[PDB]
Write an enzyme that holds these catalytic residues in place. Sequence first.
Site, PDB file in Angstrom:
ATOM      1  N   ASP A  91       0.829  -1.206   0.000  1.00  0.00           N
ATOM      2  CA  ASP A  91       0.000   0.000   0.000  1.00  0.00           C
ATOM      3  C   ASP A  91       0.867   1.262   0.000  1.00  0.00           C
ATOM      4  OD1 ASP A  91      -2.683  -1.265   0.220  1.00  0.00           O
ATOM      5  OD2 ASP A  91      -1.947  -1.888   2.191  1.00  0.00           O
ATOM      6  N   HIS A 115      11.685  12.382 -10.673  1.00  0.00           N
ATOM      7  CA  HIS A 115      11.592  10.966 -10.309  1.00  0.00           C
ATOM      8  C   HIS A 115      10.239  10.327 -10.640  1.00  0.00           C
ATOM      9  CE1 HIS A 115      10.503  13.166  -6.603  1.00  0.00           C
ATOM     10  NE2 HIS A 115       9.670  12.161  -6.394  1.00  0.00           N
ATOM     11  N   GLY A 130      17.313  19.132  -4.787  1.00  0.00           N
ATOM     12  CA  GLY A 130      18.690  19.068  -4.282  1.00  0.00           C
ATOM     13  C   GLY A 130      18.767  19.359  -2.789  1.00  0.00           C
ATOM     14  N   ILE A 155      12.843  21.300  -0.015  1.00  0.00           N
ATOM     15  CA  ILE A 155      11.932  20.167   0.176  1.00  0.00           C
ATOM     16  C   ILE A 155      12.734  18.925   0.549  1.00  0.00           C
ATOM     17  CG2 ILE A 155      10.237  18.617  -0.896  1.00  0.00           C
ATOM     18  CD1 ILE A 155      10.044  21.322  -2.932  1.00  0.00           C
ATOM     19  N   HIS A 203       8.236  14.141   0.447  1.00  0.00           N
ATOM     20  CA  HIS A 203       6.814  14.409   0.256  1.00  0.00           C
ATOM     21  C   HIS A 203       6.048  13.099   0.236  1.00  0.00           C
ATOM     22  CE1 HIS A 203       7.899  14.743  -4.312  1.00  0.00           C
ATOM     23  NE2 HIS A 203       7.581  13.491  -4.035  1.00  0.00           N
ATOM     24  N   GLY A 211      -1.017   6.628  -4.384  1.00  0.00           N
ATOM     25  CA  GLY A 211      -1.644   6.987  -3.120  1.00  0.00           C
ATOM     26  C   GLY A 211      -0.906   6.384  -1.939  1.00  0.00           C
ATOM     27  N   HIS A 218       6.399  12.725   9.748  1.00  0.00           N
ATOM     28  CA  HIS A 218       5.613  13.789   9.108  1.00  0.00           C
ATOM     29  C   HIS A 218       4.994  13.281   7.800  1.00  0.00           C
ATOM     30  CE1 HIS A 218       4.848  18.025   7.626  1.00  0.00           C
ATOM     31  NE2 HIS A 218       5.002  17.398   6.473  1.00  0.00           N
ATOM     32  N   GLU A 219       5.819  12.704   6.928  1.00  0.00           N
ATOM     33  CA  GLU A 219       5.307  12.230   5.649  1.00  0.00           C
ATOM     34  C   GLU A 219       4.205  11.199   5.821  1.00  0.00           C
ATOM     35  OE1 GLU A 219       6.069  14.180   3.450  1.00  0.00           O
ATOM     36  OE2 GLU A 219       7.848  14.989   4.457  1.00  0.00           O
ATOM     37  N   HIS A 273       0.716  12.486   6.070  1.00  0.00           N
ATOM     38  CA  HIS A 273       0.079  12.678   4.768  1.00  0.00           C
ATOM     39  C   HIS A 273      -0.412  11.343   4.177  1.00  0.00           C
ATOM     40  CE1 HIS A 273       1.189  16.858   4.746  1.00  0.00           C
ATOM     41  NE2 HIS A 273       2.475  16.641   4.539  1.00  0.00           N
ATOM     42  N   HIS A 287      -1.266  19.720   6.431  1.00  0.00           N
ATOM     43  CA  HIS A 287      -0.410  20.465   7.345  1.00  0.00           C
ATOM     44  C   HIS A 287      -1.208  21.130   8.448  1.00  0.00           C
ATOM     45  CE1 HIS A 287       2.995  20.710   4.158  1.00  0.00           C
ATOM     46  NE2 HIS A 287       3.209  19.707   4.993  1.00  0.00           N
TER      47      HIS A 287
HETATM   48 CA    CA Z   1      15.742  18.923  -1.103  1.00  0.00          CA
HETATM   49 CA    CA Z   2       0.464   3.295  -2.824  1.00  0.00          CA
HETATM   50 ZN    ZN Z   3       7.892  12.019  -5.425  1.00  0.00          ZN
HETATM   51 ZN    ZN Z   4       4.137  17.924   4.667  1.00  0.00          ZN
END
Ligand code: CA
Ligand code: CA
Ligand code: ZN
Ligand code: ZN
Length: 157
Positions: free
Chosen positions: A52, A62, A70, A74, A77, A86, A112-113, A116, A122
């Site tokens: 999942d 990507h 870089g 960020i 995510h 998903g 944190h990720e 989501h 957030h």
């Molecule tokens: Ca970065």
């Molecule tokens: Ca998935």
């Molecule tokens: Zn990505």
């Molecule tokens: Zn976030």
Amino acid sequence: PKWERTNLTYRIRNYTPQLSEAEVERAIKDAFELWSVASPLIFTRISQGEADINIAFYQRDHGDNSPFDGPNGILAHAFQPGQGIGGDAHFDAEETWTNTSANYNLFLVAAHEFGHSLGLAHSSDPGALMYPNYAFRETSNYSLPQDDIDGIQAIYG
Ligand SMILES: [Ca+2]
Ligand SMILES: [Ca+2]
Ligand SMILES: [Zn+2]
Ligand SMILES: [Zn+2]
């Protein structure tokens, strides 16, 4: 968006070489456990095949139209609950990844990720794990801030 199954699988597709494989696995496991102890969700690791939640370290473009940038900026995510992409969580391979207070602690970023991945947005509370910006917090006996408990409880009851 929210998962309709309680037992979700995950797969670590690749590894940052900056930590032992054991430390990458423990960061990820412990990040999931933070959410598990505040919800009915049970996370199950698989070694190959379709899970999942896919977890991977990628750089720049990507394949998902949200390129990384870089070093710094960020860090990672993740995608909201759903089929395919998903739930998946991507980490910027160009970061320094640590198990210390040095930028950036993999456990805390993953935690944190995964918020989501489970359906949270957030938070505006600067003390919340789901706040948009990273801040190191002591990891030893880290538990979800109350704002994040409120959030996952609101979704999964
Ligand atoms: Ca970065
Ligand atoms: Ca998935
Ligand atoms: Zn990505
Ligand atoms: Zn976030």
